[PDB]
Scaffold this active site. Structure first.
Site, short mmCIF file in Angstrom:
data_model
loop_
_atom_site.label_atom_id
_atom_site.label_comp_id
_atom_site.label_asym_id
_atom_site.label_seq_id
_atom_site.Cartn_x
_atom_site.Cartn_y
_atom_site.Cartn_z
N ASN A 10 0.02 1.49 -2.10
CA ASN A 10 -0.05 2.22 -0.52
C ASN A 10 -1.30 3.02 -0.38
OD1 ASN A 10 1.00 4.13 1.62
ND2 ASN A 10 1.39 5.83 0.21
N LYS A 12 -2.43 4.18 2.62
CA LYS A 12 -2.23 5.53 3.43
C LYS A 12 -4.14 5.18 4.33
CE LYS A 12 -0.68 7.87 0.09
NZ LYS A 12 -0.86 9.91 -0.56
N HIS A 94 7.94 8.01 3.87
CA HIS A 94 6.96 9.43 3.24
C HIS A 94 6.72 10.99 3.19
CE1 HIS A 94 2.84 9.78 1.35
NE2 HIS A 94 2.95 9.11 -0.26
N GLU A 166 9.26 11.76 -4.92
CA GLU A 166 8.02 11.30 -5.07
C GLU A 166 7.89 13.02 -4.74
OE1 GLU A 166 5.98 10.63 -1.15
OE2 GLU A 166 7.61 10.60 -0.58
#
Lengths: 249, 249
Positions: A10, A12, A94, A166
């Site tokens: 990821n 970001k 997320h 997460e």
């Protein structure tokens, strides 16, 4: 056991053309001997460079977010546009989106529902905060977020869903998650599925570890019974992501 | 008087490769005889196709949104990434963002501050809702949003700022804005600048009309003393946008 692992990068909100193209060159040159699915989530801007430039057949590209449909949503990107552009993989819900951008368990579940319908493979993110972890509400919390999502699917849909766990309570708080903790949370998710949905779906479901992963800890984490791979944050913009891939054998 | 007009196309969350490429072909073939700056705001995804494919020198491309800096903001795009990608124009604080995405007058002012610093030409959006308009708070409201932005700039910065007026109270409410109303709001903005900032800045400032514009009403609106162009919504995804351009002579 263990289905086919996933190693998701990821990126970001990072990247430059120069930097991204060197990393892609690196990936294109990397010998991947086992059956793993590698996923690269770039900013929307970088999707075209990535798509043109990334050629290793074990990599797919993904988006980090979208809204369900097109229209009068200045600055957003919808699922139809992504699909038209040839992107079939998407990360949704997320923690950074849940914390800063207003996404609730039902908004995330609605997005998930929409993506799946339009035929995306979806990486759906769940996890509990420090407060939740501290009061012993891990099970409740995680189970509530997974159930919100499950309320909107059908058994066949699970086929295109990947769950990322997460440990948000370990993300910038000064707390450290250990591989045993990672495994408890994953096993807790896995059981819930086998029960509510089916042991079948459960045995074939991929649960990614979305905490702090690096070339050093990757392997030990992978060695856990219920860890099917990673959704990697900062190490994914570095040459060490190759190592994280290798850890999935 | 009247500085150089701007005709901005805001595509919002629309577009497909096929459809966008036909429209671009159309633009590339359009003879633009007067001095106008044309702006095309596409989704982040479409920025690369647009950049490659749009060749008419009177067009620039813009983003519909961004956050100030790069990092751990999954699904977002920052100002640095845009700049690296070669995009120098950006729309910030559109009503749809203020209404749905949490943007306050200070968040919008901070974004504006950041863009300008990084050297973007900024199209900054203001306007009052139906409730505000009804209670006679147009002046207050508009003036409060413009002042928030102005608090963070310096006189030289105004050089890269364009103001779009959005009659939000006329957007999907069943109310209709007339060219006289458009002109009152624009003149009200213009005066405020001349006073707080300077008649100099004020005479060279572009104020775009961001309500409902089409090939039929465009010209009359443009004929208004304080209207320097348009930020066009739905007509901008159609061949009639050419007409809207032509209305700025």
């Amino acid at each position: 056991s263990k289905p086919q692992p996933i190693a998701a990068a990821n990126w970001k909100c990072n990247g430059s053309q120069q930097s991204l193209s060197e990393l892609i060159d690196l990936f294109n040159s990397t010998s991947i001997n086992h059956d793993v699915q590698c996923v690269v989530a770039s900013t929307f801007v970088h999707l075209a460079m990535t798509k043109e430039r990334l050629s290793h057949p074990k990599f797919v590209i993904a988006a980090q977010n979208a809204i369900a449909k097109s229209g009068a949503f200045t600055g957003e990107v919808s699922l139809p546009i992504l699909k038209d552009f040839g992107v079939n993989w998407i990360v949704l819900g997320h923690s950074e989106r849940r914390a800063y951008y207003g996404e609730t368990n039902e908004i995330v579940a609605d997005k998930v529902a929409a993506a799946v319908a339009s035929g995306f493979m979806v990486i759906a993110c769940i996890g509990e905060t420090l407060q939740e972890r501290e009061s012993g509400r891990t099970a409740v919390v995680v189970l509530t977020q997974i159930a919100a999502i499950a309320k909107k699917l059908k058994k066949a849909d699970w086929a295109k869903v990947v769950i990322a766990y997460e440990p948000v309570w370990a993300i910038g708080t000064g707390k450290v998650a250990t591989p045993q903790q990672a495994q408890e949370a994953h096993a807790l998710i896995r059981s819930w599925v086998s029960s509510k949905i089916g042991a079948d779906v459960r045995g074939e479901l991929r649960i990614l570890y979305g905490g702090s992963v690096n070339g050093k800890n990757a392997r030990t984490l992978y060695q856990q019974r219920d860890v099917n791979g990673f959704l990697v944050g900062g190490a994914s913009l570095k040459p060490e992501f190759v190592d994280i891939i290798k850890a999935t054998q």
